[PDB]
């Protein structure tokens, strides 16, 4: 552990005093170790060589060919099973995109975040639902962000829409900027056609009430959503009356 820590202190501060061939070969030795199994390289050796890799990228010293070697190793470790092992690998996918065909290659990185919701423990996927509201608003415009969310919200292989319910809420209220608040309205129309092909009858009506809340008026409809996503199943006579009130204020919102 102590011997990989002084390799990182040479590449940042003192590049030229060692060879340019020596900088790119400390990157490769943390591929074999970080893509080892959960018992081949221990958890204490795992978490300490990986935190030093996102240090060197934020330093402006590495070359353009030396930086993209770190991009490939971080994709293959998000889909390992241990989430404490796989929570640290999600931090490396950000910084390469935060130091940097432009439209095309960014398609592959975004769909890696959506699968950790599907496969992955609920101690892991609390982290993934706080980022992805804020994450999509920065990179690529909201006409492209809107297609991947709902089609991966409505799917039968969604283990719980409960933590996926908080993702969709924070998107629309940043889309309630004055330029794009009317473009909020067009996406509400297409998703209603998808419900007519049915989920189970208790389950299908719950997902309708969470959507119109996030696209509604400001003062009081928006605060209902943690009361809605509290009861996910378990239909009630009190549950039937709540669906009627929400989607009619949207009829006078048009």
């Amino acid at each position: 552990l102590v011997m990989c820590a002084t390799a990182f202190y040479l590449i940042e501060n003192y590049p030229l005093d060692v060879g340019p061939e020596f900088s790119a070969s400390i990157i490769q030795m943390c591929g074999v170790m970080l893509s080892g199994s959960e018992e081949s390289t221990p958890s204490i050796i795992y978490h300490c060589a990986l935190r030093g890799l996102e240090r060197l990228l934020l330093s402006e010293q590495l070359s353009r060919l030396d930086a993209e070697s770190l991009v490939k190793l971080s994709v293959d470790r998000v889909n390992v099973h241990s989430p404490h092992r796989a929570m640290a690998a999600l931090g490396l996918m950000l910084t390469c995109m935060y130091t940097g065909e432009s439209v095309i290659v960014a398609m592959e990185r975004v769909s890696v975040l959506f699968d950790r919701i599907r496969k992955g423990f609920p101690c892991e996927a609390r982290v993934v639902a706080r980022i992805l509201p804020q994450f999509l608003d920065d990179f690529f415009p909201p006409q492209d962000i809107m297609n991947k969310v709902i089609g991966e919200f409505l799917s039968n292989q969604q283990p719980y829409p409960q933590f996926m319910a908080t993702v969709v809420y924070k998107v629309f209220q940043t889309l309630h900027s004055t330029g794009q608040s009317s473009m909020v309205r067009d996406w509400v129309m297409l998703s209603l056609s998808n419900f007519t092909q049915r989920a189970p009858v208790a389950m299908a009506t719950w997902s309708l009430s969470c959507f119109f809340v996030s696209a509604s008026t400001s003062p009081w409809v928006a605060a209902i959503l943690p009361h809605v996503i509290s009861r996910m199943g378990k239909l009630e006579q009190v549950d039937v009356n709540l669906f009627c009130l929400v989607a009619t204020d949207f009829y006078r919102h048009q």
């Binding site: 959960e38 404490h84 599907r118 496969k119 423990f121 719980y160």
Partner: protein, 268 residues
């Protein structure tokens, strides 16, 4: 000469333990082992390297247990696991992999004592694969001390990997006997308190995890209160879960009493 050089270093190491220094009697034992590489003594060459392992782990019960020093920082903890690196490699060349795993269960009972419970998880799994061909009940007691490490190290997801490996051998070796009949009582009371703690999705829910949760939704006293606790967290019943810890506290041991505490908080 070189035979007579080894007998001189043995008289020096014993007059120092009564003098009670012990990094230097610990340095006296590593001189006996460097001669027997010039000759070839074999299983007696590994006897000089593991009496130097007993003497660097006694310098650090006087630095982190008896004399708890904030300036103690593991120079005889780095010294303890390096004389045991040359010891395990020399049993395998002679071909006794059952003696190689006796020396690695001594290195990992110190790291649970010196407060390093994540690298203690570690070296317990190295000594089992050197025993699974040979002693499958000496190999299943090195994996029950590996589940007491990761719950100190708070590795609750890596703790599901080591509990399904204990139960897959007793259906190959035990079906249960005895010694293997008490290894299976500990592993179906503690894989049920983890799947409510962390409730896995159906992609990462294995076909072995699928079988045990249909049976609930081993002693007749404790088999009845575990079917009742998988129901409440699926009903989110705050009054049901509180009266069971009051009535399951004498039943479990305090390794299984730690996994029931972390469920009642993460549902309340």
């Amino acid at each position: 000469n070189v035979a007579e050089a080894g007998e001189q270093f043995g008289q020096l190491g014993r007059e120092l333990r009564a003098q009670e220094c012990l990094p230097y009697a610990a340095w006296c034992q590593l001189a006996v082992a460097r001669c027997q590489q010039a000759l070839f003594h074999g299983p007696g060459e590994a006897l000089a390297l593991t009496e130097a392992a007993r003497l660097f782990l006694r310098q650090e019960r006087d630095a982190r247990q008896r004399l708890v020093c904030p300036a103690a920082y593991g120079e005889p903890l780095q010294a303890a696991a390096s004389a045991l690196g040359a010891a395990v490699r020399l049993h395998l060349e002679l071909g006794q992999p059952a003696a190689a795993a006796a020396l690695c269960l001594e290195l990992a009972a110190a790291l649970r004592d010196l407060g390093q419970p994540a690298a203690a998880a570690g070296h317990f799994q190295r000594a089992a694969q050197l025993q699974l061909p040979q002693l499958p009940l000496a190999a299943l007691q090195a994996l029950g001390e590996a589940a007491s490490c990761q719950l100190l190290a708070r590795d609750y997801t890596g703790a599901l990997a080591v509990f399904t490996r204990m139960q897959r051998l007793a259906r190959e070796h035990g079906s249960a006997l005895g010694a293997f009949s008490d290894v299976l009582v500990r592993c179906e009371v503690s894989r049920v308190l983890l799947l409510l703690l962390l409730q896995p999705p159906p992609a990462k829910l294995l076909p072995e995890h699928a079988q045990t949760l249909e049976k609930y939704s081993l002693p007749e006293e404790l088999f009845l209160l575990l079917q009742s606790l998988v129901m409440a967290t699926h009903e989110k019943d705050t009054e049901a879960i509180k009266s069971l810890q009051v009535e399951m506290w004498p039943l479990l041991t305090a390794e299984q009493n730690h996994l029931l505490h972390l469920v009642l908080q993460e549902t309340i």
